[PDB]
Write a protein that binds this ligand. Structure first.
Ligand SMILES: CC[C@H](O)[C@@H](C)[C@H]1O[C@@H]1C[C@@](C)(O)/C=C/C=C(\C)[C@H]1OC(=O)C[C@H](O)CC[C@@](C)(O)[C@@H](OC(=O)N2CCN(C3CCCCCC3)CC2)/C=C/[C@@H]1C
Ligand SMILES: [Zn+2]
Ligand SMILES: [Zn+2]
Ligand SMILES: [Zn+2]
Lengths: 76, 110, 107, 68, 106, 441, 815, 85
């Protein structure tokens, strides 16, 4: 049953998929962990804050605000 | 080429204000010696905040044909007991290792 | 190091092979040009002088005289699709600016 | 409670407090009466214990096996 | 309420990657788009077969193992070691996307 | 082709900065974080020079840095949360001039991940608990203790996970030797993923959640949670116990709010604006950093906006209740990533880009004519002030910093024989072209 | 209905004798059920089951979890029953089982949190004044637990009131005992409330009752022990009364006051520590002469505590403390006293750690020759502890002579074989080092006399001594009667007792390992053929020592025995790689490496291949391990051609053995394999194109071990080439094959990178067939759980549709 | 029913018995032990204090992850104690 437990733990981790995963879930997952990776890495945030001419605190707050509904609301 | 009468290097520049170089090896003996120094310093002098050195330099792609000379120069700042434990595996004394580390730096950069 | 001040974020510079001069381009987002800043300030003055009230004491002439330095108080970051760009010719031995071409507002 | 020293020591054997006790007894009696009455309790939840109120990973796995 | 092959071939930027079953997917437009990414080797091609990935033909009967040239040219001292590391050559290697299948040996 | 990497000039940009008695004596030092370098600085109270004592390459990404001290101790520790799955505690050894690793606790996989903790780090003000948190559901709490040899002991982590939750900021709350408390700005996105109309995405509020650690029962519990008026950025610990009330300051868009659990009402103060501002009227105003200065007689805060304006925040209090928040314009300096107020009267400013600054706090108290804004003042409409040159601060030291380097050319444009480095760096009106030469001046 | 709820709350049997899933299910449901069940029935039934006389440990622990859950689901309804619960669980706090105490304290803590402070105080107050001393102890411990649960300042008023009670001395005694138990239970967490507790309890040191004074001194000692090394300003109003009391009291109270003084002294500065030590020291010197033994233990503890501070210096100690200490405590009466014997040893060692080893060592070394052997073992223990902690630097000629003569006389005068004299002899000789040249003849004569005869329990102790002292025996440039000893040890090779044979082999090995094979007397070509039949002995110590000895011989004296006997010995060692013990396997690996390095890889490799062809499973696995060992000691360049030539045999079960050997070889050599990946690539190609399932499974295992072995060494070309052959096996239904394929894929995820794996998964992630989607999403989840962060840079671009935005615009910025 | 515990690991060190002494808990390898095993608090309590993580007999030495499992960061999951249901 070790394989079955692995199949239950892999499902538990947030961001994993399965044969019924849609395009929307996949894309919002990669957008969300992209925003978290931007918040983590110090020189990517530097790049963005120089590009759009904003303070780094403002870019961080904008990314956190975008975290809620990236890619718009779902289908139907 | 940075110094008069030196060798050509690849100078890079970073968004945090850092400056660094990548220099080629000219012989297999220097490459092997520095590879063994890096191997032994990866284990007996691990990064301070809990990171794996080989895993950090393989963040997005695995490392290929680069020796981290910023890990290697941390040999000069270890304690004498561990400096001896490291040096006696390379069949050498700490002053010889220090001189060999300084030679490649002064060959290219300051 | 020696430093020479600029106006906007520098993006790229080239070296003239004969004179050894530097041709730099500077560009910023959320930024006004010099002319747009001047006319926006004149606009704000003429609108605050007609605030419909004694028209007897003028803060507008004091608001137009001295510009607070942007290297100390920041540049007015105004707009979302607004740009500001400049081309500069500079001598690298000294720090003097040899030529300066200002571009239009949103270029 | 064991110590060869504890055995050695424990071997040689042969108004304001009252006021505090009375006040405590009155307060305790009032609280006991209120709980017995259960007449005016809004059940204001103090602190919610997330672990106590939420299934564990092992419990979730057992539930999944039972389902299929 | 499902595309036809010719109808989906008209919508996509690259129609030659569209196949028979591609119109039967849950999201054929994303499937065809991922089939056109500038990388990403395709599926092993025997998913729809019924012969368990080992073809019982083509005459697989052949020599067991041909050792490299360096194999042939105490047992051998550090001089023959020198020989084995002077004669050592890099073998033929396939690049990133060249999957193997039952037929591609002959 | 085989290459050897060498660093010629280390990074000089600062991400985080903490201050404390890291050597165990009465002088104060600052620990700054570069991206992957840790560094200890000590400003001289006689000349105002900032000297670098130690700098170490950590070969990782530092994401959170805190200082804490146990009761009865005279030395401060350093808690580091990084892109590894470990929390580390360090101690500076002045006689050896190095950082000694005290503790290491592993809790997850490496990398800057969504649900693995390491982005947020809070500590109990008395030093008996530390909380490490991710941007998503996972939070962990470690209890810190001490043995009879006065060495630090660490416990096994306690979990406080909560699915479908985003965290904006975590701070420890100052209680009077009561059970440790942690405050979090949280958001639940479960409803927003189920509504295709897009109305559950809006109508979704931040909450201010309080987590209580019961040392007697050894578990973490959610005690209080309240929805906020608008979305706020970072939080500020208010000093409590026997010196001050025990709440939090929420910095938000155009406002600053005081909040405490119990019978305390909410107190709001709008952020003043510059008179005759030339910036786009649609834009709001937020605070970007803060600095607390506690004294045995009083305390105050220093908060800075995106324009670089530092205001001095004081709190008008009762026996237990807070009644007003008062704001007063203090000064204008470049936009900082961190601010440290040092005893002996020094303010350290680490800018987001360009040179860093150390200021002497010349004028203590406030004997001035400029207006003081308050939460009790009625306004239908916002406060206005006039920015002016430095009055409360004097510039004592300036640390060079090449961040951010944007373009470089190595060339012999003068008629020396050694080439020079021509570096286009800096952003905004603080950009410059710098010529670098190898040698002493 | 009443038994309605009873029959349904047999959930606790659902849990007691039940499965873990239904355990947690019934736990959650009874937690939801508690508030409606009511505390009455629930407790009425659970407290009997917790009072069950033969309940288990885990069962008791589960009962504690259930009590905590019921307390969570019913807070203020537990009040009318609190008293009852306490009478059941006020015991379990003085229980000799530690975990019983932890469980009782947890139960009382959750009960105090469920109820209020006033309720606990009102139910616990009547038993404060009880006369039964058994109740006043559980009451104090329960009050301490309640203070630890609800906080100290919440109980501070009740404490301040109860130990000022003029009604009876029992209430004051119990309040001070509550403070003491609070200190004992909470430790260094009392530091913010130290002064409050001290001012609450300080007035008891001058009471008219003697039991109150004693308990107050014990509470002060407990607080000072909990506070160390912090807190001296809070102990200021106690310094005057405590010292006046040690000056006036005598007896039990004097012992309590002295314990308090001793726990308080290490908190002071040099001045106060130095000044206070003088006073308590004259009092302690007076008290040296006491007949009571509890008093002796307390005096020893206080002496050790005070003599370890900085305010007390070695001059005052040697001038005032050492004469009476050594005159009153060092008599064999102390030796037969088992209670304070260890205390005396520790106090003496910690005295020597400050005053200097020479004085202590002399004062007791004259006493090594004694009629009683208890007093001899005591001195030997103390001497060897001091020697191990400080050394023999300032030990001089007279002291060295006396030490040697004493340890020699103590060795011979020995009734039963003890480890004390053995360790003393060993550490004394090891600390002296190259200084003991003539006592080397003397010691050799002594060990020769002990090893000659007398029951082999003296002989095995002599062999242990030889094994631990041969280094200093030979490093002093002496080898002849060393050989005289080796000859006798050789003659003592047939022994019926395996324990003595182990020590004999250890001594022989220590000899041959430290003396050179050069110029040494007992010939190797005589020892080794006599040694090879002992390898089949079944004792663990004999086996380990024999293997170590054969390994040393093969490492240094390899040229003294024919290669045929070496081959036989290695083929015999082959079977020891299956040993159930780890030291046997370690020594066997070492010795096999030495023998292979000695006789050459060619013949042993031929024999190992023949043995791999014809034997059962376990022997073939051991042969595979042996091939890997040979290939690591003698570079794999010498093994790989002969092993690859065996894959050329046209017969299954021979190629599979070659593949298993290659798998374990690469797993065992790790980083050394970077030079040999190009040589085995065509063989792995052939094995991956094969129809046999074991062929492909083992080739996948080889790929995995090779991938994880080379990482950061630039071998990505061959690994991508091999992935091109591994990948078509993802549609395999056989469980072992797919397991090996998943292992190989996760190894290639590390060696080759996640970008390549995502490139292999992209086109199948959304395939129309559900089988392809299942397989590809399993592989993708495995790639995603490891290195989630790197994938950010690798995802392909996906265009916006009419409804949703999918482009990541920030990465398109261009500075 | 051979399932790992996979709970948050604490400060307790994993133990191995005389039969499992050299083994890796996750992959059952014997080569290059690299990382000390940590277990949760419910696996280290009362009668469970010292026990083999693989089988459950009396522990004699420390449990270790192998270098192969350490490279793949398989030491970063929860408690690796084998628990049977
Ligand atoms: C596939 C083979 C099987 O799994 C097989 C190992 C196993 O199924 C059998 C059952 C059993 C109990 O008989 C297994 C025996 C065990 C062994 C032969 C291992 O030996 C031991 O356990 C001895 C002891 O635990 C530690 C010895 C040690 C460190 O050499 C260990 O191997 C290693 O760690 N290596 C491998 C790496 N090698 C290099 C050499 C350079 C420096 C050292 C590290 C790198 C050093 C030695 C044991 C190897 C045998 C496989
Ligand atoms: Zn493993
Ligand atoms: Zn076992
Ligand atoms: Zn566990």
């Amino acid at each position: 049953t070790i394989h079955s437990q692995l199949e239950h733990l892999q499902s538990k981790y947030i961001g994993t998929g399965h044969a019924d995963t849609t395009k929307w879930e996949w894309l919002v997952n990669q957008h969300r962990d992209s925003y978290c990776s931007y918040m983590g890495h110090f020189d990517l945030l530097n790049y963005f804050a120089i590009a759009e001419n904003e303070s780094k605190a403002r870019v961080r707050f904008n990314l956190m605000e975008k975290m809620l509904q990236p890619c718009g609301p779902p289908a139907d | 080429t940075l110094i008069p009468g030196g060798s050509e290097s690849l100078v890079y520049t970073t968004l945090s204000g850092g400056i660094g170089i990548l220099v080629p090896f000219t012989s297999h003996e220097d490459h092997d010696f520095f590879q063994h120094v890096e191997m032994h310093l990866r284990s007996e002098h691990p990064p301070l905040c809990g990171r794996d050195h080989l895993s950090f330099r393989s963040y997005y792609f695995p490392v290929k044909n680069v020796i981290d000379g910023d890990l290697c120069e941390q040999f000069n700042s270890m304690e004498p007991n561990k400096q001896k434990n490291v040096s006696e595996e390379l069949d050498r004394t700490p002053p010889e290792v220090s001189k060999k580390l300084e030679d490649i730096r002064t060959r290219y950069a300051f | 190091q020696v430093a020479f001040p600029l106006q906007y974020t520098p993006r790229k510079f080239v070296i003239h092979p004969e004179s050894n001069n530097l041709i730099i381009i500077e560009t910023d987002h959320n930024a006004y040009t010099e002319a747009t800043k001047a006319q926006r300030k004149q606009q704000m003055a003429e609108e605050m002088v007609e605030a419909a009230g004694e028209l007897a004491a003028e803060m507008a002439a004091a608001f137009l005289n001295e510009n607070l330095p942007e290297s100390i108080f920041g540049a007015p970051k105004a707009g979302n699709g607004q740009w500001a760009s400049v081309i500069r010719v500079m001598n690298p031995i000294q720090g003097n600016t040899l030529d300066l071409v200002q571009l239009e507002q949103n270029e | 409670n064991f110590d060869e020293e504890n055995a050695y020591f424990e071997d040689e054997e042969e108004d304001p407090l009252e006021a505090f006790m009375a006040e405590v007894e009155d307060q305790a009696a009032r609280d006991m009466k209120r709980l017995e009455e259960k007449d005016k309790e809004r059940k204001n939840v103090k602190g919610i214990r997330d672990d106590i109120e939420e299934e564990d990973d092992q419990e979730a796995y057992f539930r999944y096996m039972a389902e299929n | 309420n499902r595309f036809t092959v010719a109808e989906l071939k008209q919508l996509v930027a690259r129609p030659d990657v569209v196949e028979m079953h591609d119109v039967t997917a849950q999201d054929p437009k994303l499937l065809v788009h991922l089939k056109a990414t500038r990388n990403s080797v395709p599926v092993p091609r025997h998913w729809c077969f019924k012969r368990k990935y080992l073809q019982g033909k083509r005459g697989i009967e052949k020599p067991p193992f041909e050792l490299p040239d360096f194999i042939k040219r105490d047992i051998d001292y550090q001089k023959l070691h020198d020989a084995f590391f002077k004669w050592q050559t890099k073998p033929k290697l396939t690049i990133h996307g060249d999957l193997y299948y039952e037929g591609k040996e002959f | 082709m085989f290459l050897y990497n060498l660093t010629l000039q280390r990074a000089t940009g600062i991400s985080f900065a903490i201050h404390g008695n890291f050597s165990g004596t009465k002088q104060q030092e600052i620990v700054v974080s570069r991206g992957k370098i840790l560094e200890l600085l000590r400003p001289d109270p006689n000349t105002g020079k900032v000297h670098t004592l130690l700098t170490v390459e950590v070969f990782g990404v530092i994401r959170s840095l805190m200082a804490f001290r146990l009761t009865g101790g005279t030395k401060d520790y350093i808690v580091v949360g990084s892109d590894s799955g470990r929390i580390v505690i360090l101690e500076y050894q002045p006689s050896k001039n190095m950082f000694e690793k005290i503790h290491q606790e592993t809790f997850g996989k490496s990398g800057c991940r969504r649900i693995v903790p390491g982005q947020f780090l809070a500590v109990d003000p008395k030093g008996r608990a530390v909380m490490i948190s991710a941007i998503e559901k996972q939070k962990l709490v470690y209890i810190l203790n001490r043995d009879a040899a006065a060495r630090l002991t660490i416990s096994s982590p306690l979990e406080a996970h909560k699915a479908n939750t985003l965290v904006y900021h975590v701070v420890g709350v100052d209680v009077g030797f009561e059970n440790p408390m942690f405050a979090c700005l949280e958001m639940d996105y479960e409803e927003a993923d189920n509504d295709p109309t897009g109305e559950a995405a809006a109508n979704t509020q931040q909450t201010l959640t309080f987590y209580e650690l019961d040392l007697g029962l050894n578990h973490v519990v959610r005690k209080y949670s309240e929805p906020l008026e608008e979305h706020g950025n970072f939080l500020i610990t208010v000093p409590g116990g026997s010196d001050g009330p025990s709440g939090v300051l929420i910095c938000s868009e155009n406002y600053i709010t005081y909040k405490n659990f119990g019978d305390q009402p909410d107190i709001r103060c709008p952020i003043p604006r510059r008179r005759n501002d030339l910036d786009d009227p649609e834009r709001g105003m937020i605070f970007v950093c803060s600095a607390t200065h506690k004294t045995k007689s009083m305390f105050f805060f220093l908060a800075q906006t995106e324009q670089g304006d530092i205001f001095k925040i004081t709190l008008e209090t009762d026996e237990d209740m807070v009644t007003e928040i008062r704001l007063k314009y203090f000064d204008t300096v470049p936009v900082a990533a961190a601010m440290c107020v040092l005893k002996t009267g020094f303010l350290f400013v680490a800018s987001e880009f360009g040179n860093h600054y150390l200021y002497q706090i010349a004028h203590l108290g406030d004997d001035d004519e400029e207006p003081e804004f308050s939460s009790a003042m009625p306004l239908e409409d916002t406060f206005f002030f006039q920015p002016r040159p430095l009055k409360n601060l004097v510039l004592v030291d300036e640390l060079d910093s090449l961040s951010p380097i944007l373009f470089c050319q190595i060339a012999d444009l003068a008629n020396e024989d050694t080439p020079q480095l021509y570096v286009a760096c800096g952003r905004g009106p603080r950009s410059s072209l710098r010529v670098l030469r190898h040698g002493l001046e | 209905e009443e038994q309605k709820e009873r029959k349904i709350m047999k959930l606790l049997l659902k849990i007691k004798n039940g499965t873990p899933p239904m355990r947690k299910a019934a736990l959650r449901q009874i937690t939801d059920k508690a508030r409606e069940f009511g505390a009455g029935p629930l407790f009425n039934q659970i407290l009997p089951l917790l009072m069950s006389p033969t309940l288990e440990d885990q069962e008791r622990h589960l009962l504690v979890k259930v009590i905590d859950r019921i307390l969570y689901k019913l807070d203020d309804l537990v009040r009318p029953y609190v008293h009852k619960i306490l009478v059941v669980i006020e015991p379990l706090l003085i229980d000799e089982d530690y975990y019983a105490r932890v469980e009782g304290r947890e139960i009382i803590s959750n009960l105090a949190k469920a109820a209020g402070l006033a309720t606990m105080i009102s139910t616990m107050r009547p038993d404060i004044d009880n006369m039964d001393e058994y109740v006043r102890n559980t009451t104090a411990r329960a009050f301490a637990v309640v203070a630890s649960a609800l906080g100290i300042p919440s109980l501070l008023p009740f404490l301040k009131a109860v130990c000022k009670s003029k009604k009876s001395w029992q209430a004051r005694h119990t309040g001070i005992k509550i403070v003491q138990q609070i200190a004992i239970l909470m430790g260094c967490a009392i530091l913010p409330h130290l002064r409050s507790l001290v001012e609450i309890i300080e007035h008891g040191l001058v009471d008219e009752q003697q039991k109150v004074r004693t308990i107050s001194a014990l509470a002060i000692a407990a607080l000072a022990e909990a506070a160390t090394p912090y807190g001296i300003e809070s102990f200021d109003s106690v310094l005057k009364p405590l010292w006046k009391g040690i000056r006036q009291h005598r007896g039990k109270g004097l012992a309590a006051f002295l314990k308090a003084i001793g726990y308080l002294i290490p908190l002071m500065d040099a001045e106060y520590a130095n000044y206070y030590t003088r006073e308590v020291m004259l009092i302690l010197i007076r008290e040296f002469q006491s007949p009571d033994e509890e008093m002796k233990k307390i005096v020893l503890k206080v002496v050790k505590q005070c003599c370890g501070t900085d305010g007390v210096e070695a001059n005052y100690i040697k001038t005032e403390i050492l004469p009476p200490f050594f005159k009153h405590f060092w008599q064999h009466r102390m030796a037969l006293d088992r209670r304070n014997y260890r205390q005396l040893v520790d106090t003496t060692v910690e005295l020597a750690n400050k005053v200097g080893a020479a004085e202590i060592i002399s004062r007791i070394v004259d006493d090594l020759k004694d009629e009683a052997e208890q007093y001899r073992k005591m001195v030997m223990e103390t001497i060897e502890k001091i020697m191990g902690n400080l050394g023999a630097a300032d030990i001089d000629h007279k002291l060295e002579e006396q030490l040697i003569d004493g340890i020699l006389y103590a060795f011979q005068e020995q009734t039963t074989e003890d480890s004390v004299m053995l360790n003393g002899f060993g550490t004394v000789v090891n600390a002296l080092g190259k200084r003991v040249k003539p006592y080397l003849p003397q010691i050799c004569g002594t060990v020769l006399w002990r090893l000659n005869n007398k029951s082999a329990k003296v002989r095995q102790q002599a062999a242990d001594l030889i094994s631990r002292t041969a280094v200093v025996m030979k490093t002093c440039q002496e080898e002849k009667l060393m050989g005289h000893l080796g000859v006798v040890l050789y003659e003592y090779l047939g022994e019926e007792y395996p324990e003595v044979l182990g020590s004999i082999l250890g001594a022989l090995k220590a000899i041959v390992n430290v003396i050179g094979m050069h110029k040494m007397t007992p010939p190797i070509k005589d020892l080794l053929p006599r040694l090879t039949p002992i390898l089949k002995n079944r004792h663990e110590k004999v086996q380990e020592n024999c293997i170590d000895l054969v390994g040393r011989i093969a490492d240094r004296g390899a040229e003294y025995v024919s290669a045929r006997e070496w081959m036989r010995i290695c083929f015999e060692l082959l079977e020891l790689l299956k040993a159930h013990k780890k030291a046997i396997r370690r020594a066997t690996v070492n010795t096999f490496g030495y023998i292979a390095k000695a006789i050459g890889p060619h013949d042993v490799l031929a024999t190992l291949l023949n043995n791999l062809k014809v034997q059962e499973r376990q022997n073939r696995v051991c042969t595979t391990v042996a091939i890997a060992i040979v290939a690591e000691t003698c570079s794999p360049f010498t093994v790989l051609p002969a092993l690859m030539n065996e894959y050329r045999v046209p017969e299954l079960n021979v190629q599979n053995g070659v593949l298993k050997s290659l798998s374990f070889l690469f797993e065992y050599i790790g980083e050394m394999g970077k030079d040999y990946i190009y040589a085995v690539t065509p063989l792995l190609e052939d094995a991956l194109m094969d129809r046999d399932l074991v062929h492909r499974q083992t080739a996948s295992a080889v790929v995995q071990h090779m991938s994880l072995g080379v990482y950061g060494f630039g071998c990505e070309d061959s690994l991508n080439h091999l992935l091109n052959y591994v990948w078509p096996n993802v549609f395999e239904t056989s469980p072992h094959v797919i397991q090996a394929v998943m292992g190989a894929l996760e190894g290639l995820r590390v060696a080759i990178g996640p970008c390549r794996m995502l490139q292999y998964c992209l086109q199948g992630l959304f395939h129309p067939a559900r089988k392809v989607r299942d397989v590809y999403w399993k592989i993708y989840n495995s790639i995603y759980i490891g290195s989630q962060d790197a994938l950010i840079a690798h995802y392909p671009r996906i265009y916006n549709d009419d409804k949703n935005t999918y482009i990541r615009y920030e990465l398109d910025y261009i500075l | 029913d051979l399932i790992f515990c996979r709970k948050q690991a604490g400060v307790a060190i994993g133990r191995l018995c005389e039969k499992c002494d050299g083994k890796c808990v996750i992959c059952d390898s014997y080569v290059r032990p690299c990382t000390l095993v940590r277990i949760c608090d419910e696996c280290n309590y009362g009668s469970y204090q010292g026990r083999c993580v693989i089988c459950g007999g009396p522990g004699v030495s420390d449990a270790y992850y192998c270098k192969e499992c350490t490279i793949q960061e398989k030491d970063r999951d929860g408690c690796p104690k084998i628990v049977n249901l």
